[model samples]
Target chain A: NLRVLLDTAIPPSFCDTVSSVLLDDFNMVSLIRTSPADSLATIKQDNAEIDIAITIDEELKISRFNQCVLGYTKAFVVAHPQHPLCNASLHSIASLANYRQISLGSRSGQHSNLLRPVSDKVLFVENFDDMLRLVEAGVGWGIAPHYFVEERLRNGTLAVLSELYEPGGIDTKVYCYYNTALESERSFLRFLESARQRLRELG
Target chain B: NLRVLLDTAIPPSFCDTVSSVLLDDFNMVSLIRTSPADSLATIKQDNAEIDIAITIDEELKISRFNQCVLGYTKAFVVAHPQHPLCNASLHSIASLANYRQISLGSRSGQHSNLLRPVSDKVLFVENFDDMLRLVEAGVGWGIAPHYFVEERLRNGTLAVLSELYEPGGIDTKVYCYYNTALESERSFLRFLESARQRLRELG
Candidate 1:
């Protein structure tokens, strides 16, 4: 008997695409959706319960030309109460040369990785909530995803910077597989075919 | 008369190659050395005093087999003084949820443009100095050029998260043109010869 694991960054949205095509086409032994971290563990453990993995490249390209999407919450630049520009909507970045910047997390996370290319000036905090508290207390400016800062922006505690587009569209490649030894499994063939057909039909 | 600017961003070494070939082969009219920002501005403003501009493109292709040289800086995730991992180095970006980020200048700056393509969350600031100050005071984590934080890192005032490479190099296109209406003056030809010879001698 064999098993398959589906690894993804975000939650899987194509259950039908998988069940109908993958399960029916390839006769997949079994399929389970999990996060990258967990998938890495599964691959390492050599568990019979897992077989295939899916991932996007650094540029976030999946299988097609669609680009990754960026999400943000609106917010304003606030300074420390003692600093000169506490409640002001900072007109220029050069103006706040004296304050400190705090990021919401450590070196590992979606935000941190994204910030890697730009973190030369700011500090990283452990949690996004802390960033919000710091902002309310007039700490510094940082980025937050829409889900976390939507209410804050609505309440006027955060400001939104415009000029944003979705990162990568829904073009991703997910697959189903079994241990190489299980290539002879009859069900696996059925699973693969069903999944591939389902995907084309939807498109 | 035409004024031009130069910068280290583009392969400074190639200045000789481009100058020599363009001027000698094409009979370019004018050449002046200036910064990248200034060079870009001269072209945009259409200042009569400035004619042609030469600078490295954010992206350049010096050789066919070599990988593109990217531009970027070390970006860090900053935490509040009271945060549990404030003093620790962030190894993985897994779950920092609420941090806000802001840039210190227009999106046109190399640093800002590079980061925009990756991170889903970011804030734009008008002034670069202010971004540094905010980072120092622990307001919000800010992104900046490596040169900007060298002094701070040495002094122990700031922490670094990770170094990043910009995804794609900018397509560099050096532009040289003269007011066709301006008759070829003697100085123009002299300057052209010297510049072309200098460029040719570079290789």
Candidate 2:
């Protein structure tokens, strides 16, 4: 039985699609969803147990896990319609520093300086959904994936504040990590690439 | 302007209720949502800046902070309807060691030992919502608040697997923390207790 661990960075819908394909085409037995930190711990604790892992952490290469970049996505700074800075002219990052910032913390206990240098008052959330809820409730502004907030933007629940400011976006690269011992399972890697391609085409 | 920080452990709807009360009844200025760790950090950095904090961490008894227990809730072990262990005879904790256990991690970089002693293969997520999605997707079994899973339980999307095991549930005590400097803000604390009472009555 092939045991695959899907990292939380992968969308739940994407995980569903890949899980179905693995079961239908490869007859794989197990699929576990994990956070990046826990996934790394699993790999380090028993490499033989996990056949493959999908992660967003670029630092996972240190564990000697073979990796392949699937595709890239963009993240944007967004805020609720009622936020103080929502109506203000947001020309630079400094304008956002005055308002509370909502940030997603790393699962591995490693604090990334990604948004720290920008805002003094920041709230660290666990995932994008939590960040979205906090932002939607008019608690603060945050960086979220474009796809995650597209509907909200259309409905005016969330506004893309990034357009009002320079350097308001970041790129997220998705990657697949696996043990070299699983080289024989080339078909799994091909499926992942094809799925990502399909998603890009849809967008 | 009274600045209040609400911890993420409090339900979003409950937070909304309390926020509305504060804004409508009192002349509050801003309400920032934060995780327990961030709330603590904010209080530690500048106690005067944060008027109040609502949290679930019972261990936070700082000298400068006043504490109060709003109420209590139950956490249950749950799994999706189609999970292998959903209908199986769950005899011991060892039987669950083979399956992936979903756990909620603290945003403050503090790793709680809550689920560590339960399973060897565990996945840590950020919040109850993330935990619910993973469990609903049949990815793993997890501990979730009873109120959070009530709807899913009624709809049959999730099943309480705790009945099959020995240790079925755990208690979660909700707390409200405030700066000792805000001892004059007695009305705000009274409002919190009233809102919690209303929620319990509704449930």
Candidate 3:
């Protein structure tokens, strides 16, 4: 049975869907919902326990691993419907300094600043869901993947504040990485190719 | 239409379940997700935007607020079946120092040490779901509410590691706080009473 490491960046709902698909199609056992940095460290330490990793980090171009681009996603700055900045016509990003900025905190002991570097009035959360919840409560503004907040946006719970900022939206590329030695496993290779095709089709 | 600020400590699944129940039975529109600390701050500032708040903080006994005990939950230490510590004969809490510890990171900017304080080899996540996922991936062991891991514990994906530590579990009390001024709203009061009754029934 193949053991796969799924990145924490993937939404839990999407992870469940992908895990079910992997189980039904490839009979692969997935260790879904792991920290991206920790997964990278595990693979770097040459841990044979994890055979493959699905991550959103595009910086991993190491020779020891084979990488494939799964798809692309956009991150947008969002605020609650009642947030002060939600209704105001902000002139510049500097104006955002007035309100608290919510940012994603990594579980792997790494500091992440996915938004503007504000020295004060900033909060860090572990996942996109938490960020969305905080933003919806009118607590602060945050940046989240479009897919993660699409339903809320449609329902008017959250409003995209990217229009108010000059650096509108961030484009993120998702990838699947595996050890070069795993190339010998034909079935795993077939599954990876099929997964990439599925992701592209979804996109 | 009462605006309710749900504490970040509440699980998302539970929040959805309660929100649907409130909408169907009470015709109450619940803003059923928010940062705990931010909610407290909003209430303390006398912001009339939020009429009610549901939280797990027992120390919030303020004169301006009327409180009710919703229910109680127990937090247990759990790990995946493949985790090395799952089968180990642990003699002391220090024995766990060798393995990575997964703990919850609050979006409310409050540091939560639900587990024994460890200076090193610790991972902090946003919610019980993330903690469960990491534990299921054999990455670490951590504490979580019993209700959150019931299904997984039954399925054997996660095993209880509480036996290793002297303090096996942490008991948490859930509470609902509302402005004393809102007590005059008969419909809101009725709903609050019914909600507390429902929680007791579940318990």
Candidate 4:
């Protein structure tokens, strides 16, 4: 009955796949999701309620018990297959000017500037899943984790926006924060292996 | 270019359905989602990134700017159609003893006590959509916004957890927090009507 806290950005598919892995060894599992802010806070403060966290967020500036970079995400800039951009031959970021950009609800850090929209018009949604859905709804184009949109792009339900998409997509690190601080020191080597393996398949 | 901050609780269908209403009026729209903690902080501080918020949370206490109770919600307690709970004739909440409960990542206020699970084992998720997805996956039974689960229940893909469901389900208020302090004192009567109208249909 280990409590696993997942950062919201981690795709739901991870849960299904991770739960199945090493199933013969561990007991059954249940997952929980958390806001990046809350997730970060829990990891920094060592909230005992959480045993491990699959978080895809910035590295903590200063910390006690902290992160293990599981893998780097190959993210996406996606839109519905029929989006006007999908049919266009736009070759650069400048070409994205006319189309509205859908972005995450909030973000920070140095790389944030690179994601700036050319148009003042933008759609901001709270989570990656909703961003994916809004893009799927044809409201506008937006970025998503590669794994999330990979299947869709292959299936033609979603399409990469254009050549403006950076090679390897956005390479953001995925984190797995766990506990080794509290004395009743225990190990999750088995669970960590499952996570690292799944992430390896994605990266 | 109005920024609408939706608490993670609002469903994606709301965006597609709302965007279609009054399409002739708005130039177009982009949506963004925010963590509940961040969303709540923005409202209390009157952050300009937000022009309005569709929140399902506790009433603000001793606030500067305030809230408009847009409507009430009829939320649900559901499980996948094939889950064991579907076949049972559980007559009371006590009958839910053996099963695992899936709950939201965080909560507050008096009503939170009623949602207490009989089992220590639970699956917690960051938002309603993922919570609904986890339930849809046959993981365990959990609560959801009625508007979110209504179609699933009607479609037979999800089922109410039997008579333990309260009459009219759980009654929670939905909020529409708008700006007034800044001489930007304007109105969204047209848009507000659309939101209230939609919420009315749900409750």
**For each prediction, how big is the interface RMSD?**
17.5, 18.5, 19.5, 19.6
- Model 1, B1-203: lDDT tens digits are 23444443334454554455445445444556543334343444543355444443232111111111112112344433433334442222221223545453333455423334233355555544566677666665654444456567667777654321111111122333333332244544454445534543322
Q: What's the residue-level lDDT of B187 in candidate 2?
A: 69
Report the C-alpha lDDT of model 3 over B128-157, residue by residue, as the tens digit. Answer: 677788989878887677777878988988
- Model 4: runs farther than 4 Å from truth? A1-203, B11-30, B35-48, B82-84, B87-91, B95-98, B106-119, B162-164, B182-186, B197-199
Q: By TM-score, how accurate is candidate 4?
A: 0.40
Candidate 3 DockQ, CA atoms: 0.01
Candidate 4 lDDT, A34-86, residue by residue in tens: 75535665555544456567766644322444444555555667788887767
DockQ of candidate 4 compared with the true complex: 0.01
Docking quality class, candidate 4: incorrect
Candidate 2 local lDDT, B6-114, one digit each (tens)? 7665666767767777766578458887644355656666635777777655442365666555555556778988788777542322256568888766455554233
Per-residue accuracy of model 4 over B75-131 as CA lDDT, tens digit each: 676887777767553222333555777776643321222334445477766667777
Q: Give me the displacement of residue A153 in model 2, in angstroms.
A: 1.9
Query: Relative to the unseen true structure, what is the C-alpha lDDT of residue A115 in candidate 1, on a scale of 0 to 100?
Result: 35
- Candidate 3 per-residue lDDT, tens place, A10-52, comes to 5554455456556655664857466543556555555456667
Q: Sorted by TM-score, highest first, which candidate order results?
A: 2, 3, 4, 1
Each prediction's TM-score against the native?
A: 0.30, 0.43, 0.42, 0.40
lDDT of 2 at A94: 36
DockQ of each: 0.02, 0.01, 0.01, 0.01
Cα lDDT for residue B91, candidate 4: 26
Please report how far candidate 1 places residue B15 from its true position, in Å: 11
- Among these predictions, the greatest lDDT belongs to 2
